[model samples]
Target: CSNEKARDWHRADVIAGLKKRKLSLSALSRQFGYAPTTLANALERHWPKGEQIIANALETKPEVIWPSRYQAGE
Candidate 1:
């Protein structure tokens, strides 16, 4: 189940963050062997695999982007 913590990062910011790092959902998807919108789907919903991929691209953790979707310690 998803937690109740507030999201510290907005969706737009997440996309922009990736852009700043020269990353994009399409590119990441291709790199990860998925459809073009696979990673983008995570921006609008809860997809642990995609979230982790995006987080790694940003050099951060998924919890930092969507705290509510993750447990306190895991």
Candidate 2:
């Protein structure tokens, strides 16, 4: 029920993805090309800019890319 909620989502595969692209993120989201809203959307819903970017760099689906934070409670 996850990709159902990003189950197609990956969990720990974003780091190397970003590195491969020679990229990064921050309050510096503007530099990243999107908006802080990425975070807000993810914060409120899903796929923050950071997630989207790395996921994109990885050439994978953002919904399929699971960020580590999602694993915190487990």
Candidate 3:
């Protein structure tokens, strides 16, 4: 059987996960002393730290949300 291509979680889904838990990208950035868009960058690109922060908020791991950006052994 052909393997299905893995992909990052949908941007809206990530945002919804955070929202469902009362978390916001801007607020998370502020807590980390990062630029307002820093955590937001995870939506458009591979930002490891941002991915971690967002994942933590959702009570999951970055790899779980962005499987395409993380190799199995890494």
Candidate 4:
């Protein structure tokens, strides 16, 4: 069995599907099992210009991806 976290694949697949669907991180998180904040952070960390995609989809501009409080520098 894999040693990875339970939701690891789910999170990645969900994020990818959401991006393909042009769904915002917040909306996807709200609709899915993941937390909005956690989804946002994942997008920020894994994708380039992730904040813009999320903002555009959600119809809101986020100053920073995942916010500073929750973000860990790259």
Candidate 5:
């Protein structure tokens, strides 16, 4: 199930930083204590939910940095 070149390749980075912190996506689900699917669905399209968490960690605003929401000519 670990294909490096799969269509979900971009999905992989969703939790790389946490893994470096020795945590799992499931760990955040518990840390936030919302639901099991929170981080899971956060990675999906037109849904910038994960951006909220990451932005908070980076002291950023999700609406400002997300590629899908902002572009050079957009």
Candidate 6:
């Protein structure tokens, strides 16, 4: 359950996606249904390398950010 490499990769994707959109840490917590502190910690620990793919994905990314509009509260 504590796989550093796997977690870091996943966290990089998630954190990079959020960062590219300029979403606040608290907003990310709400979106993922996780505590703000937990998300923040994950970002700090897992995303240390950075999220270039996430950044590129955000640009011309289409509507794949969320699975459903309802999930995004839209």
TM-scores for every candidate against the unseen true structure = 0.70, 0.35, 0.71, 0.28, 0.52, 0.33
Pairs that clash in candidate 2: 2-5, 2-6, 2-7, 3-6, 3-7, 6-9, 9-64, 10-64, 10-66
In model 5, the runs with Cα more than 4 Å from the true position are 1-9, 45-50, 58-65, 72-74
* Candidate with better TM-score, 5 vs 6: 5
Model 2 Cα lDDT, one tens digit per residue, 45-72 = 6535555655565567454555444554
Tens-digit lDDT string for candidate 3 (30-71): 878878877666566646777777777777787887776668
lDDT for 7 in candidate 5 is 39
Model 2 scores a TM of 0.35
lDDT (Cα, tens digit) per residue for candidate 1, span 3-71? 322465665676687788688777888988978766666666656778778788877887887776568
Q: Model 5, residue 17: displacement in angstroms?
A: 3.3
Point out where model 4 deviates above 4 Å: 1-22, 44-74
Candidate 4 has what TM-score? 0.28
Q: Please report how far candidate 3 places residue 51 from its true position, in Å.
A: 1.2
- Model 3, position 63: C-alpha lDDT score: 80
What is each predicted model's overall lDDT from 0 to 1? 0.72, 0.49, 0.70, 0.52, 0.58, 0.46
Query: Which candidate number has the best lDDT?
Result: 1
| Total clashes for model 3 | 0
Q: Candidate 6, which segments miss by more than 4 Å at Cα?
A: 1-22, 46-74
Looking at model 1, report the run of 10 residues with the lowest lDDT sum.
Answer: 1-10
- Could you give candidate 4's per-residue lDDT for residues 38-60 as a string of tens digits? 66675427554545545456465
The lDDT-based order of candidates, best leading, equals 1, 3, 5, 4, 2, 6
Q: How far is candidate 5 from the true structure (C-alpha RMSD, Å)?
A: 5.0
In candidate 3, list every pair of residues with a backbone clash: none
Clashing pairs in 5: none
